[PDB]
């Protein structure tokens, strides 16, 4: 019966710009102040900016001061956030939030958010690196090996072992989005220590989006 709805989320390059909008309804928009709060992927909330009820008074986090620009059009019930010179740090979900300061500070109604992904990076095939034997006194125990898939875009890559012949003891981890904006993951598989001497292990890494396939043998260290 009352809500805020963010729009204009997009991908932009480093040094680029972008205008976020927030449509409001169910209340007198100009009767309350507003706020932009952002959530970097897998990090905590961070306040960005806020604007007065009159619509004339603007405050900013020291991180976004002089680069971002809060604004509102009370005739059309809309908040906006002009973001200039955007850098990698700015990548997050941006939620428009109604601000209420009766007694103390609290944001009493949020939108669904909208993603902004500053990217210097386009479509890149992965580099594939050979994981250590890790014969670090595991003795009779399970000794496991793997492959590093580094600096590929966009998702996803697929990993198989000995062309999919070996799948028992395999663990392939989700990728990380790096500060570069570039995806990296690893796939590890545990086969007996004694077997290493006379068993070949090769990870097959296929990146459909760059049509890169790499076969990479992995066997002890010196």
């Amino acid at each position: 019966e009352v809500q805020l709805l963010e729009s204009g989320g997009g991908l932009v390059q480093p040094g680029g710009s972008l205008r976020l909008s927030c449509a409001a309804s169910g209340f007198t928009f100009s009767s309350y102040a507003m706020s932009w709060v952002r959530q970097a992927p897998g990090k905590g909330l961070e306040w960005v900016s806020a604007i007065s009820g009159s619509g004339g008074s603007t405050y900013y986090a020291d991180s976004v001061k002089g680069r971002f620009t809060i604004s509102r059009d009370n005739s059309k019930n809309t908040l906006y956030l002009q973001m200039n010179s955007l850098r990698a740090e700015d990548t997050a979900v941006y939620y428009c939030a109604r601000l209420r300061a009766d007694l103390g500070l609290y944001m009493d109604l949020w939108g669904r958010g909208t993603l902004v992904t500053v990217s210097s990076a386009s479509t890149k095939g992965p580099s594939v690196f050979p994981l250590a034997p890790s014969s670090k006194s595991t003795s009779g125990g399970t000794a496991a090996l793997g492959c590093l898939v580094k600096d590929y875009f966009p998702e996803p890559v697929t990993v198989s072992w000995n062309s999919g012949a070996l799948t028992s003891g395999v663990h392939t981890f989700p990728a990380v989005l790096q500060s570069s904006g570039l995806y990296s993951l690893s796939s590890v598989v545990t086969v007996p220590s004694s077997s290493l001497g006379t068993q070949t292990y090769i990870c097959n890494v296929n990146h459909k989006p760059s049509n890169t396939k790499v076969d990479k043998r992995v066997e002890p260290k010196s």
């Binding site: 897998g42 905590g44 007694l103 500070l105 009493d108 580099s127 690196f129 994981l131 990296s184």
Partner: protein, 213 residues
């Protein structure tokens, strides 16, 4: 940002009660009022508690908040799987001149029983080193509840630069798993005696350590 200090992860069984603490200073919690936000995974934050101890209408009486000096507290009785979420503590900081929040506390309603994390720290490959790059790889698996703290050591000095770590996602065995990557120069790797990955699950820590030679 994590201006305010919250505990990364708290856990309880359905029907029980939990308290989440928020640590600050004079400039923030000291003189100004605190609020609590529930972010259900994927969805936006929602106002839970405002003005230290006030609930919006429709937020149940299970939820309550307290504050004294430079710390505040969120109480939840009658725990249910629905409450399983990330919890944020929010106030005003006058010395930063900015609205500030805690790093956020992940809640894990205990359905299945706990498991201790297995850590496997592969070092930079000879191959990678020759390419003028060096990635320490920390693989963490078979733990519950789905919330860990990952710390990195250059010898015995803490390292938070060049660190990227995954959000815990359950693999085919209904158990959480995550990964952390430390980016070094070949010089950094060779100019230290050892590097270590410390994974802190609940009250415990498992550390793995790697030597260049």
């Amino acid at each position: 940002q994590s201006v305010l200090t919250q505990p990364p992860s708290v856990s309880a069984a359905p029907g029980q009660k939990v308290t989440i603490s928020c640590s600050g200073s004079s400039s923030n919690i000291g003189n100004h009022y605190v609020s609590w936000y529930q972010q259900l995974p994927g969805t936006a934050p929602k106002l839970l508690i405002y003005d230290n101890s006030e609930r919006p209408s429709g937020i149940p009486d299970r939820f309550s908040g307290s504050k004294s000096g430079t710390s505040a507290t969120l109480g939840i009785t009658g725990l249910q799987t629905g409450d399983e979420a990330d919890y944020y503590c929010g106030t005003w900081d006058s010395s930063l001149s900015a609205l500030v929040f805690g790093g956020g506390t992940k809640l894990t309603v205990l359905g299945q029983p706990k498991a201790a994390p297995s850590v496997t720290l592969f070092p930079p490959s000879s191959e990678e080193l020759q390419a003028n790059k060096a990635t320490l790889v920390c693989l963490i698996s078979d733990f519950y509840p789905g919330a860990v703290t990952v710390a990195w050591k250059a010898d015995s000095s803490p390292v938070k630069a060049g660190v990227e770590t995954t959000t815990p996602s359950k693999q085919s065995n209904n158990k959480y798993a995550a990964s952390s990557y430390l980016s070094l120069t070949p010089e950094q790797w060779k100019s230290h005696r050892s590097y270590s990955c410390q994974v802190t699950h609940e009250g415990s820590t498992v550390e793995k350590t790697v030597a260049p030679t």
